[PDB]
């Protein structure tokens, strides 16, 4: 479960 976001 991701707790942050990074570029696709």
């Amino acid at each position, epitope marked *: 479960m991701p707790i942050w976001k990074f*570029p696709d």
Partner: antibody
Amino acid sequence: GREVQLVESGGGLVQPGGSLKLSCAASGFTFSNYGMSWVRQTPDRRLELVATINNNGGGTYYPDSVKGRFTISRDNAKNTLYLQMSSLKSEDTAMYYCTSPGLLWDAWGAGTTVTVCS
Amino acid sequence: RDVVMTQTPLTLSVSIGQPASISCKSSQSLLDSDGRTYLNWLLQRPGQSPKRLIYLVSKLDSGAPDRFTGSGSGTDFTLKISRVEAEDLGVYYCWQGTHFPQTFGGGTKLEIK
């Protein structure tokens, strides 16, 4: 708790229009599992993300204030993150932090100071 | 268009033991297509690197004390300190990760009266 650590290096003096490479060594966790980001803090104490990269290195982002001048990259076998800065201006004089917000354990480095000369 | 994070108050002077409340309002909804809201709270103690206290609006960082509570939704977010102690003084920042660029709030300085 477990010991995760990030250590920035390569900060120092640089002339306007010059170039500088920063490195961030990661230890204590599987580096290749996480995206990484460079966050800088200007003398006015404001925080700004200048570069971010996903875990495999194929996806990067830069804000417009910096886009085209900085290049983020990573070497997962070497457990190292890089920030290549070029065409530097006085606005880039700041403390440069290395961080991985995807980690459940708080992971920031102590930072490395960059000073753009007159 | 970049998301602007308007954080208030700029300075908050408190006595030790008193409660505190910090607000962060986004110019754009921070709800992601995957159903999560990426909103972090950080505290930079003097002479220290920033330290995460909350992620995903309300989840308390395992290295942060149980005196911080994160809440909010959409564009309005709030950080509350149940009782301000010496450890809690410093500059707080809200950080949104839903949209690129992932921008910070302007900071909130929590100091002693």
